[PDB]
Design a protein around this ligand. Structure first.
Ligand SMILES: Cc1cc2nc3c(=O)[nH]c(=O)nc-3n(C[C@H](O)[C@H](O)[C@H](O)COP(=O)(O)OP(=O)(O)OC[C@H]3O[C@@H](n4cnc5c(N)ncnc54)[C@H](O)[C@@H]3O)c2cc1C
Ligand SMILES: Nc1nc2c(ncn2[C@@H]2O[C@H](COP(=O)(O)OP(=O)(O)O)[C@@H](O)[C@H]2O)c(=O)[nH]1
Ligand SMILES: [Mn+2]
Ligand SMILES: [Mn+2]
Length: 554
């Protein structure tokens, strides 16, 4: 029936400057050598992405979908949600959010400047008086760094980003922020990923696996998910939102945003010319993550009933999906997954990589990560979350006039502290760089899920123990898969082999311990793996004083 996009012909032009790589990368040219392999998606490739996301969606639902949606609206009805004040919505604006056509930006929005507070006030009234006129949006290509894969066709084109004016974005937080904070948790319960730290995510999947008698898992991911979201999906989202207990003023504005913004509208490039019309999810609205995850949950759960998946346990993060279920035999499990996919395709959530039943937890990869197992020094299995380090290493090398890789490094040391590649590569290079700059004690910003938390490099032992436990400093033996991948990835980027990093780390640790104090605590805990005769590590008192609750949530 409906096309996800249609285009006028105007190019998807850049939002200001697109950085040039430099001839010397002085913070990462001692980390790896093949900098030619590290690129950034640019607005030029946006045309290629546009072709790949423009297609006719033909959705066909059934009594399983219908049934699931009923159950989810009923779960939704248990939620009560408030309007946010204009002032509170204003103050959730990030400090550098794209400015407004109306002569103000994030600085004035966050500071409750009168010109801004006024304009937003009238933007809001228009939402309650006008339930129909489309709201214009800007389309820009996303700038993200990857490592070239010639197997996957050179460089990836840039994802398409579609957002309204800053004034509108404040208004959606007034109407919908409180619901984003409560609805996903409410209708999915423990199935909602985006509430788990890496260690917690591992507990959940481990616990799921073990309570199955003959467990079987698979992961699923949708192909160009935003462009698969039908107009009917987005209104079905509105009805899910309206299931909750809401002030009538919210309901009006929620419906108005849905009809004028979420179900679609015209897009303008950064030069200002009409670019195309959109009839799918705009990745850029406040409801992007919540919409994605709830709509993915409905279809995925409907398809589970369609394919006869027995005793499913799900984990949903956007459009990434893990299902641990009871295995009906290898023969039936393959047939069931084909049914799941045939159903998901009928619902307009077609797959990228076709899913496949697996019976070993390490073999299931979703959210760009997988559980893996390492032994302690005595033989105790410890489980943990890891990933292919290729993209983290590539972003470790993105280094230009306007961007520093050092935050990237921190975020991986925090998020993947138990991994062999963080412990031996990133941690070593991180602490070597900061010592030489004599910036060990200078705060860095850790970035996760839009928020931004200040951390002091010398607090990493306490932070890591609070997040992953003391097992993060004592993984002795890693798995055949993990060793194979990390070795491969380091070769692929011209980084030294792990053998060399062990040498480098002994030096770093020496220097850390030498300067005593909190630096020496980092040397002893974070680098205990590097020395022949390991020190007995004890719990850190400061770790018990640490509230990281908000770090890995939304
Ligand atoms: C609501 C939300 C807001 C985010 N805002 C920012 C930001 O402002 N600046 C920044 O640099 N990073 C942002 N991110 C990315 C995030 O901080 C991490 O880099 C990464 O998503 C967390 O690790 P992952 O294992 O989920 O990686 P992934 O495998 O890439 O994530 C898995 C799933 O999470 C969803 N997802 C991934 N990236 C985004 C994204 N940008 N926005 C919405 N959903 C996404 C997708 O549905 C994906 O299927 C955001 C992520 C979410 C979920
Ligand atoms: N607002 C916003 N949403 C994103 C971003 N990246 C991914 N998403 C959302 O998550 C969806 C699926 O995630 P992804 O792995 O990238 O799948 P893809 O769109 O099918 O290539 C995307 O279509 C987006 O709606 C981003 O950078 N910003
Ligand atoms: Mn995905
Ligand atoms: Mn996808």
């Amino acid at each position: 029936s409906s096309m996800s996009y249609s285009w006028t012909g105007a190019l998807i032009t850049p939002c200001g400057p697109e950085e040039e790589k430099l001839p010397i990368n002085p913070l990462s040219n001692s980390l790896l050598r093949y900098h030619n392999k590290v690129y950034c998606t640019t607005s030029k490739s946006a045309s290629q992405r546009a072709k790949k996301v423009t297609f006719d969606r033909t959705q066909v639902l059934d009594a399983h979908y219908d049934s699931v949606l009923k159950d989810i609206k009923l779960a939704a009805s248990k939620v009560s949600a408030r309007l946010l004040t204009l002032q509170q919505a204003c103050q959730l604006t990030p400090p550098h959010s794209a400015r407004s056509k109306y002569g103000f930006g994030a600085k004035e929005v966050r500071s409750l400047s009168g010109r801004a507070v006024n304009h937003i006030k009238s933007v809001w009234k228009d939402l309650l008086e006008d339930p129909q006129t489309p709201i214009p949006t800007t389309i820009m290509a996303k700038n993200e760094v990857f490592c070239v894969d010639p197997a996957k066709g050179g460089k990836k084109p840039a994802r398409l980003i579609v957002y309204p004016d800053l004034g509108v974005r404040v208004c959606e937080k007034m109407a919908l922020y409180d619901i984003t904070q409560k609805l996903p948790q409410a209708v999915m319960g423990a199935s909602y990923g985006f509430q788990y730290s890496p260690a917690q995510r591992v507990e959940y999947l481990l616990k799921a696996w073990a309570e199955k008698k003959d467990p079987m898992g698979f992961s699923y991911d949708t192909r160009h998910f935003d462009s698969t979201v039908t107009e009917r999906d987005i209104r079905t989202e509105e009805s899910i939102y309206q299931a909750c207990s809401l002030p009538e003023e919210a309901r009006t504005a929620i419906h108005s945003l849905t009809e004028r913004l979420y179900v679609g509208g015209p897009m303008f490039n950064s030069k200002g010319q009409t670019c195309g019309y959109r009839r799918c999810r705009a990745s850029g609205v406040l409801t992007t993550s919540m919409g994605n995850t709830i709509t993915c949950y409905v279809k995925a759960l409907a398809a589970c009933k369609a394919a006869g998946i027995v005793a499913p346990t799900m984990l949903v993060c956007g459009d990434d999906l893990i299902v641990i279920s009871e295995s009906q035999g290898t023969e039936e499990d393959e047939r069931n997954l084909r049914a799941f996919t045939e159903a998901m395709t009928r619902y307009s959530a077609p797959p990228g990589d076709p899913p496949r039943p697996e019976y070993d937890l390490e073999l299931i990869t979703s959210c760009s990560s997988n559980v893996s197992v390492a032994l302690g020094p005595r033989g105790r299995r410890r489980y943990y979350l890891t990933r292919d380090p290729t993209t983290p290493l590539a972003r470790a090398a993105w280094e230009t006039v306007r961007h520093s890789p050092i935050n990237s490094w921190l975020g991986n040391i925090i998020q993947y502290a138990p991994t062999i590649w963080v412990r031996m590569v990133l941690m070593t290079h991180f602490f070597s760089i900061l010592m030489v700059q004599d910036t060990l004690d200078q705060n860095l910003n850790f970035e996760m899920y839009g928020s931004v938390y200040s951390v002091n490099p010398l607090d990493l032992p306490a932070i890591i123990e609070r997040l992953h436990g003391l097992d993060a400093f004592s993984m002795h033996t890693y798995s055949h898969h993990e060793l194979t991948r990390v070795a491969s990835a380091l070769r692929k980027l011209g980084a030294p082999p792990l053998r060399v990093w062990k040498s480098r780390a002994r030096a770093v640790r020496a220097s850390l311990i030498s300067r005593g104090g909190k630096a020496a605590v980092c040397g002893r805990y974070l680098f205990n793996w590097a020395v022949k005769t390991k020190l007995k590590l004890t719990p850190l008192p400061e770790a018990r004083l640490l509230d990281l609750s908000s770090w890995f949530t939304v």
